[PDB]
Amino acid sequence: KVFGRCELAAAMKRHGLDNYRGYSLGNWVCAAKFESNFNTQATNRNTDGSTDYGILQINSRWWCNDGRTPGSRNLCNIPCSALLSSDITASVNCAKKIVSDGNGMNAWVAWRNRCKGTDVQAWIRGCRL
């Protein structure tokens, strides 16, 4: 599924990401935008052979199991394919673990490089939330 911006904002809000670990909702929407262009089916292969999955491009090196990232962890205890669902629950729940892990949203490269320190509230501007 390719979410609309506000649709995703609302879904993320419903799933408790607004101000989760202090990260306002726009951070999460910004991250999703630049990680996946709001596409739940996005996958990208990393240089180490892991793959990033889903709307928040959660990687299989640490967070999910895709059966082809040897030596990796599965800290969200999910098949990576679950992160490709049109239902963002699994991604959100995993993202909550990630962002809780001490590094905040810096785990999301695109967030660090494209959202952090920007006016992320712009990403939820105009949305009914």
Ligand SMILES: CC(=O)N[C@@H]1[C@@H](O)[C@H](O[C@@H]2O[C@H](CO)[C@@H](O)[C@H](O)[C@H]2NC(C)=O)[C@@H](CO)O[C@@H]1O
């Ligand atoms: C939370 C999450 O999974 N974020 C992704 C990053 O992990 C990806 O970065 C890449 O992650 C792999 C596995 O840890 C690293 O080996 C790789 O070096 C790292 N790539 C970079 C450029 O840092 C990122 C890839 O675009 O996608 C999400 O942000």
Ligand SMILES: [Cl-]
């Ligand atoms: Cl868009």
Ligand SMILES: [Cl-]
């Ligand atoms: Cl915000």
Ligand SMILES: [Cl-]
């Ligand atoms: Cl694996």
Ligand SMILES: [Cl-]
């Ligand atoms: Cl959802």
Ligand SMILES: [Cl-]
């Ligand atoms: Cl933080």
Ligand code: NA
């Ligand atoms: Na990425």
Ligand code: NA
């Ligand atoms: Na894994």
